[PDB]
Amino acid sequence: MNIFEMLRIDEGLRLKIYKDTEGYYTIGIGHLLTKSPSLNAAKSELDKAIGRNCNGVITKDEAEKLFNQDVDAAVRGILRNAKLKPVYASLDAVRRCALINMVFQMGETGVAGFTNSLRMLQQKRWDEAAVNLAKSRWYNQTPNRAKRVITTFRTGTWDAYKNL
Ligand SMILES: [Cl-]
Ligand SMILES: [Cl-]
């Protein structure tokens, strides 16, 4: 299992513009287009992202290219983040993937605000970090996904994704 396979499971793949869990225009493998309520705004952003007139739809290759870009960006973003870098550096491989997953979903800014959880992961207090992570809007709004990521941080294994 790897970060791509993990996010592919959590985000799914849609070749046509769609609304994410928060109602925002997205496409491909969880690639957010805009928070704006306008579908045209979304269509515009899409064309600009792909470099062609797509009229709301892309190919699997295009979706995967966006995905490659997005994962790269999340990692690099973590590495540039003063608050995130040290946590990421302290974690083992599997757990680093859980952190990337969150940053992919909420942005570096959002993740950076889980201060207490972050310190717990740095101190390797797995069970405590897991309880803290769950006391969040994130957990209440997307519980199934949040549970998979939290189990990953808790165990350092891929069990939560095994059989999906
Ligand atoms: Cl809460
Ligand atoms: Cl969910």
UniProtKB/Swiss-Prot annotation:
The keyword Hydrolase applies. Its EC number is 3.2.1.17. It comes from Enterobacteria phage T4. InterPro entries: Endolysin_T4_type (IPR034690), Glyco_hydro_24 (IPR002196), Lysozyme-like_dom_sf (IPR023346), Lysozyme_dom_sf (IPR023347), Phage_lysozyme-like (IPR052619), T4-type_lysozyme (IPR001165). Endolysin with lysozyme activity that degrades host peptidoglycans and participates with the holin and spanin proteins in the sequential events which lead to the programmed host cell lysis releasing the mature viral particles. Once the holin has permeabilized the host cell membrane, the endolysin can reach the periplasm and break down the peptidoglycan layer. It is found in: Host cytoplasm. One of its GO terms (cellular component) is host cell cytoplasm. The active site is at E11, D20. Changing D20 to A/N/S/T: Complete loss of enzymatic activity. Optimum pH is 7.3. Belongs to the glycosyl hydrolase 24 family. Changing T26H: Facilitates transglycosylation more effectively than hydrolysis; covalently bound substrate. It catalyses: Hydrolysis of (1->4)-beta-linkages between N-acetylmuramic acid and N-acetyl-D-glucosamine residues in a peptidoglycan and between N-acetyl-D-glucosamine residues in chitodextrins. It comes from the Viruses. GO terms for biological process: cell wall macromolecule catabolic process; defense response to bacterium; peptidoglycan catabolic process; viral release from host cell by cytolysis. CDD domains: T4-like_lys. Substrate binds at L32, F104, S117, N132. Its main location: host cell. Induction: Expressed late in the viral replication. It is an enzyme of class 3 (hydrolase). Keywords: Antimicrobial, Bacteriolytic enzyme, Cytolysis, Glycosidase, Host cell lysis by virus, Host cytoplasm, Hydrolase, Viral release from host cell. This is Endolysin. The gene is E. Changing S117F: 10-fold decrease in enzymatic activity. GO terms for molecular function: lysozyme activity.
